Amino acid sequence: MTDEEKVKAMRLARAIASDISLYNEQKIIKGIEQDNLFEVLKEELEEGRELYKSRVSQEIFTKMNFFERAINDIVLRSKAHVKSKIWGSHHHH
Numbered sequence: 001m002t003d004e005e006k007v008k009a010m011r012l013a014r015a016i017a018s019d020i021s022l023y024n025e026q027k028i029i030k031g032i033e034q035d036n037l038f039e040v041l042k043e044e045l046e047e048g049r050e051l052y053k054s055r056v057s058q059e060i061f062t063k064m065n066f067f068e069r070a071i072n073d074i075v076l077r078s079k080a081h082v083k084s085k086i087w088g089s090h091h092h093h
Contacts, residue, residue, distance in 0.1 A: 001059055006066075009056040013070035016048040021074045032082040037075065045071065 021028065024044060031037035038045070052067045060066070 001057065001063075005057065005060060006064070009052075009060045009064065010066045010070070012055055013052055013066040014073075016052055016067070017070035017074040020044045020048055020071075021078060028078050029082050032079055033086070037078075 020041065024041065027040050028037065031040035034040075048071075049067055053061050056066075
């Protein structure tokens, strides 16, 4: 594995993860509200992982965890974002 292959793979993992966030916004809001985000995102996550797999080396896919790391980041950011907007929507004048 080269540093350049690792950079491209991390960039792809992050792009897939933010695609999932951007194009499923309403589903993600409800999933965070109902504590079933991974349930509601099941098909997107699996299709995203398969896309990632087709575009990186077997070595990167099996030994690195770039896809998992990128999904975890987007889930943490989404939880903070959605809870903050919900809080704001009933704490304003």
